Amino acid sequence: EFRVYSSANNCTFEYVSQPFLNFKNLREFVFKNI
Amino acid sequence: NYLYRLFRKSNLKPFERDISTEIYQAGSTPCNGVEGFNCYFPLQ
Amino acid sequence: RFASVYAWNRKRISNCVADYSVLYNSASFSTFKCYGVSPTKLNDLCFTN
C-alpha cells in the first residue's frame, strides 16, 4: 500500500535500481551525508 | 560604427591580430559566401 | 498538441546526459539565439537541472 505518504511535491531524481534476492541475514547499512 | 571581431575558431595569441574575415563556421560545412544555418558573419 | 500561451512549459528534466549538438545539427528548428553557450553547444559544460 501507500499508507506512508499522501502528498507529492516536485520530487526530482526518482530512483529504482536494486533487484532483491536463527536470524541469519544481518542487513547492515551505513547512511552518510557528506 | 565601430566593429567587433566576436567570432574566432581559436583564441587570440598575445599581441596578435585578425584582419581577414571569411564567414565564421559554426560547424555545418558549407560557408562559401553564405550565412546559411550555422555560418554567421564573424564581425558584429 | 499544446502548451498554452498564458501558461509556460517548465518541465523539470534532470539527472540525465544528452547531446545538445544532436539538436544543433538538426535543421528542423527555425532559429538559434542561444545565450548560454558562446561557441557551439553545451556538451562541454555541466549544470544543475
From Swiss-Prot, chain C:
Q: Outcome of mutating S28P, per the record?
A: In strain: Omicron/BA.1, Omicron/BA.2, Omicron/BA.2.12.1, Omicron/BA.2.75, Omicron/BA.4, Omicron/BA.5, Omicron/BQ.1.1, Omicron/XBB.1.5, Omicron/EG.5.1
Q: How does it assemble?
A: Binds to host ACE2. RBD also interacts with the N-linked glycan on 'Asn-90' of ACE2. Cleavage of S generates a polybasic C-terminal sequence on S1 that binds to host Neuropilin-1 (NRP1) and Neuropilin-2 (NRP2) receptors. Interacts with host integrin alpha-5/beta-1 (ITGA5:ITGB1) and with ACE2 in complex with integrin alpha-5/beta-1 (ITGA5:ITGB1). May interact via cytoplasmic c-terminus with M protein. May interact (via N-terminus) with host bilirubin and biliverdin, thereby preventing antibody binding to the SARS-CoV-2 spike NTD via an allosteric mechanism.
Query: According to its UniProt entry, what is the function of this protein?
Result: Attaches the virion to the cell membrane by interacting with host receptor, initiating the infection. The major receptor is host ACE2. When S2/S2' has been cleaved, binding to the receptor triggers direct fusion at the cell membrane. When S2/S2' has not been cleaved, binding to the receptor results in internalization of the virus by endocytosis using host TFRC and GRM2 and leading to fusion of the virion membrane with the host endosomal membrane. Alternatively, may use NRP1/NRP2 and integrin as entry receptors.
What is this protein called in UniProt?
Spike protein S1
State the species of origin.
Severe acute respiratory syndrome coronavirus 2
Where in the full protein does the shown chain start and end, and how long is the full protein? 346 to 394 of 1273
